[PDB]
């Protein structure tokens, strides 16, 4: 309608280790009282090749939703490196942060995440076995990709396809 609108997002604690939590300070406006909570979720894209390697990192229910301008910190566990193809682990991928209301997604914010080793020795000559504790993750927070979707609230009345995951 839209009863809730994203106003701003700050990626906290960035860069970070691959194994550190994700932290976002999210600012949203709510215009009317709602029956239901907001569900915020974060999805890590394991492979640019299929939805088959996505991992839902966490989700958090926010509510009852107060009318006005709201701020909260969303934190989420890192993905399991075990379940990401070894060859795609230390590369660019995307994260998608979305908010749904009663199951209906009304906003998505996508970010590219660059993954690179912390030591010069490993960057040019990476091993076959991946050193997860040595991955530094950088979310490209200056480049958010925001897609809003129109929903009913309470009343009825690689880089090619990474870019595609973002939209």
From Swiss-Prot:
It comes from the Eukaryota. It comes from Saccharomyces cerevisiae (strain ATCC 204508 / S288c). Changing residue 145 to A: Reduces acetylation of histone H3 on 'K-56' and enhances sensitivity to bleomycin, camptothecin, HU and MMS. The chain holds residues 2 to 155 of 279 of the full protein. Changing residue 112 to E: Reduces acetylation of histone H3 on 'K-56' and enhances sensitivity to bleomycin, camptothecin, HU and MMS. Present with 6230 molecules/cell in log phase SD medium. Residues 2-155 are annotated as: Interaction with histone H3, histone H4, RAD53 and the RF-C complex. One of its GO terms (cellular component) is H3 histone acetyltransferase complex. It is found in: Nucleus. GO terms for biological process: cellular response to stress; chromatin organization; DNA replication-dependent chromatin assembly; negative regulation of DNA damage checkpoint; nucleosome assembly; nucleosome disassembly; positive regulation of transcription elongation by RNA polymerase II; protein modification process. Residues 2-143 are annotated as: Interaction with HIR1. Changing residue 96 to D: Reduces acetylation of histone H3 on 'K-56' and enhances sensitivity to bleomycin, camptothecin, HU and MMS. Changing residue 48 to R: Abrogates interaction with histone H3 and histone H4 and enhances transcriptional silencing. Reduces acetylation of histone H3 on 'K-9' and 'K-56'. The gene is ASF1. The keyword DNA damage does not apply. This is Histone chaperone ASF1. One of its GO terms (molecular function) is acetyltransferase activator activity. Changing residue 45 to D: Reduces acetylation of histone H3 on 'K-56' and enhances sensitivity to camptothecin. Keywords: Chaperone, Chromatin regulator, Coiled coil, Nucleus, Transcription, Transcription regulation. Histone chaperone that facilitates histone deposition and histone exchange and removal during nucleosome assembly and disassembly. Facilitates histone deposition through both replication-dependent and replication-independent chromatin assembly pathways. Cooperates with chromatin assembly factor 1 (CAF-1) to promote replication-dependent chromatin assembly and with the HIR complex to promote replication-independent chromatin assembly, which may occur during transcription and DNA repair. Interacts with histone H3/H4 heterodimers via both histone H3 and histone H4. Binds with higher affinity to H3/H4 heterodimers where histone H3 has been pre-acetylated on 'Lys-14'. Interacts with RAD53 and this may impair interaction with histones and chromatin assembly; the interaction is reduced upon activation of DNA damage or replication checkpoints which in turn promotes histone binding and chromatin assembly. Interacts with the CAC2 subunit of chromatin assembly factor 1 (CAF-1). Interacts with the HIR1, HIR2, HIR3 and HPC2 subunits of the HIR complex. The keyword Repressor does not apply. Belongs to the ASF1 family.
